[PDB]
Design a protein around this motif. Structure first.
Motif, PDB file in Angstrom:
ATOM      1  N   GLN A 121       0.819  -1.205   0.000  1.00  0.00           N
ATOM      2  CA  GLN A 121       0.000   0.000   0.000  1.00  0.00           C
ATOM      3  C   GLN A 121       0.861   1.267   0.000  1.00  0.00           C
ATOM      4  OE1 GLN A 121      -3.089  -0.012   3.062  1.00  0.00           O
ATOM      5  NE2 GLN A 121      -4.396   1.193   1.678  1.00  0.00           N
ATOM      6  N   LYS A 127      -4.219   5.672   0.391  1.00  0.00           N
ATOM      7  CA  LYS A 127      -5.527   5.215   0.833  1.00  0.00           C
ATOM      8  C   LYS A 127      -6.152   4.186  -0.115  1.00  0.00           C
ATOM      9  CE  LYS A 127      -9.615   5.589   2.973  1.00  0.00           C
ATOM     10  NZ  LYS A 127      -9.807   5.068   4.349  1.00  0.00           N
ATOM     11  N   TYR A 180      -1.782   1.114  -4.541  1.00  0.00           N
ATOM     12  CA  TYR A 180      -0.830   0.048  -4.226  1.00  0.00           C
ATOM     13  C   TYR A 180       0.200  -0.125  -5.307  1.00  0.00           C
ATOM     14  CZ  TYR A 180      -4.407  -1.617  -0.882  1.00  0.00           C
ATOM     15  OH  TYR A 180      -5.336  -1.716   0.127  1.00  0.00           O
ATOM     16  N   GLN A 222       2.890   9.487  -1.505  1.00  0.00           N
ATOM     17  CA  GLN A 222       2.771   8.176  -2.158  1.00  0.00           C
ATOM     18  C   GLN A 222       4.110   7.736  -2.728  1.00  0.00           C
ATOM     19  OE1 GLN A 222      -0.330   9.141  -4.938  1.00  0.00           O
ATOM     20  NE2 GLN A 222      -1.895   9.257  -3.323  1.00  0.00           N
TER      21      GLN A 222
END
Lengths: 66, 66
Positions: free
Chosen positions: A4, A7, A10, B48
């Motif tokens: 991950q 949220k 991935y 991210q």
DNA sequence: TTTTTTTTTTTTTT
């Protein structure tokens, strides 16, 4: 294997039809109540993933400067 | 800033509408003879991108085992 | 038919 990074995002590693894909992908929840891969994403082959890793230092330099 | 990872694939780093994005994307050559970003790709935000980097070791281990 | 951040949606070209 799924890793991950956000949220609903991935990195996933899978064998698809004999070849390993490294997929950087946003997921969604569908009307039947199951998790599915979305349209935002890219599946890298091992050489592309290798090239990405090789350029991380340069990528980070550009991020740092912005 | 563009960082090539395959024949037609790049990581790009830019400020778009006030937000830094790390985009991993396939490009194509359009009918007018110009390079354009294609539909296979994803724009990561810096958090991210940082989580992706944090998990490279685990991602690489999954590749060896698949 | 072709981008861009936490509905209408997968899957490899130096």
């Amino acid at each position: 294997a799924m890793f991950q990074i956000g949220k609903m995002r991935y990195v996933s590693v899978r064998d698809f039809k004999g070849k390993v894909l490294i997929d950087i992908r946003e997921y969604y929840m569908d009307p039947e109540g199951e998790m599915k891969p979305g349209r935002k994403g890219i599946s890298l082959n091992p050489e592309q993933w290798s090239q990405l890793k090789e350029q991380i230092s340069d990528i980070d330099d550009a991020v740092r400067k912005l």
